[PDB]
Structure formats: C-alpha cells, structure tokens
C-alpha cells in the first residue's frame, strides 16, 4: 500500500 513499494 505504500507509495514507493510497487507490492504494497
């Protein structure tokens, strides 16, 4: 879900 973790 966060912005620089493409699988988060």
Same mark, same amino acid.
């Given at each position: 879900? %966060? #912005?620089l973790? #493409?699988? %988060?």
């Amino acid at each position: 879900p %966060g #912005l620089l973790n #493409l699988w %988060g």
